[PDB]
Amino acid sequence: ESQYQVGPLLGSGGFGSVYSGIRVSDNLPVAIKHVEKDRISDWGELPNGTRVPMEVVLLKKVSSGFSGVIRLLDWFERPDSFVLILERPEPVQDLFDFITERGALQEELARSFFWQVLEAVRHCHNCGVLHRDIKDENILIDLNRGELKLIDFGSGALLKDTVYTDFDGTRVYSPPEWIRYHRYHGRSAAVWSLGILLYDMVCGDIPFEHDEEIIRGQVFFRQRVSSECQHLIRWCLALRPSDRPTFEEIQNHPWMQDVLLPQETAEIHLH
């Protein structure tokens, strides 16, 4: 309020509105996200009784120096909204706009980005958080350091081992068991979404736009993609949840060997 200087609106949508800002005390870049109270479907509570959106609970759980998930720095409650103060790398482009500009990515670049998103999603699950909205729109690229950040925990949940029967993330990344039965388990649904994301990186667009295509699960490659990379994608997009790989199996797959470091990624592909 007097703590932050507000800059341009960055975007708005299902998630609320997010602005660029600066923390006046040390000129730290921040993003300032406003979430309307009446659009908040899940609430949690802090170890002290305050009632908060569940997004603040999940962000606190994953907050830390490990840079692959966005860090919540502070939050405020107002009469009809909460305001979240998040870290802001700079300069940043989201992965969706990056793909719009470059088209399908060279596999060495897709490998580096996909690897980083797997490390971020493992960090969420280690911290007991299921994101439920992994997609290019929710990944920021720090262009100078080559580091990706997963953002927007607004559709997420606490990770559990039993079935989920509610979902409000992005339908064209959602698995066939959600489309058909309104039921999924968190890790295999996350794996399906990561297969959609990997196809999006290497082909320049998602593979399925319609319920019918998600349920049939046949994947056609519209760009030249190596057999190893097509194997990994088809494995993530296995129709039966228990036929999908674990995160360890994804990261030990032959396609994922010899990944670039984030700095080398920036020097080779982003600079």
Ligand X SMILES: N[C@H]1CC[C@H](Nc2cncc(-c3ccc4oc(C(=O)O)cc4c3)n2)CC1
Interaction residues for ligand X, span 145-174 (CB under 6 A): 151-152
Q: Annotated binding residue at 87?
A: yes
Could you give the C-alpha distances from 140 to 9, 10, 26, 83, 237, in angstroms and in order? 16, 13, 23, 20, 24
Structure tokens at 197: 């994301």
Minimal distance, residue 115 CB to ligand X, in Å:
21
Q: Does 259 bind ligand X (CB under 6 A)?
A: no
Q: Annotated binding residue at 49?
A: no
The DSSP annotation for 185-212 comes to -HHHHHHHHHHHHHHHHHHSS-S--SHH
> Considering only CA atoms, which of 138, 241, 251, 135 is closest in space to residue 193?
135
Residue 73 is inside which H or E element, if any?
Answer: strand 72-77
Interaction residues for ligand X, span 128-147 (CB under 6 A): 137, 140
Distance, in Å, from the CA atom of 249 to the CA atom of 36, rounded to the nearest integer, reads 40
Minimal distance, residue 169 CB to ligand X, in Å:
13
Q: Annotated binding residue at 242?
A: no
The residue (of 60 and 253) whose beta carbon lies closer to ligand X is 60
Interaction residues for ligand X, span 33-52 (CB under 6 A): 33
Distance, in Å, from the CA atom of 142 to the CA atom of 167, rounded to the nearest integer, reads 29
CB 152 within 8 A of CB 124: no
Minimal distance, residue 86 CB to ligand X, in Å:
4
Rama region for 132: left / alpha / beta (φ>0; ψ in -120 to 50; rest): left
Residue 258 catalytic? no
Candidates 46-54, 87-95, 193-201, 245-253; binding stretch for ligand X (CB under 6 A) = 87-95
Q: Annotated binding residue at 94?
A: yes
Q: Which residue is listed with tokens 């659009």?
A: 39
Q: Catalytic: which of 38, 133, 205, 258?
A: 133
Q: Does 18 bind ligand X (CB under 6 A)?
A: yes
Q: Annotated binding residue at 18?
A: yes
Q: Does 254 bind ligand X (CB under 6 A)?
A: no
Q: Which residues are catalytic?
A: 133
Would you tell me which residues interact with ligand X (CB under 6 A)? 10-11, 15, 18, 20, 31, 33, 70, 86, 88, 92, 94, 137, 140, 151-152
Give the residue numbers of the binding site.
10-18, 33, 87, 94
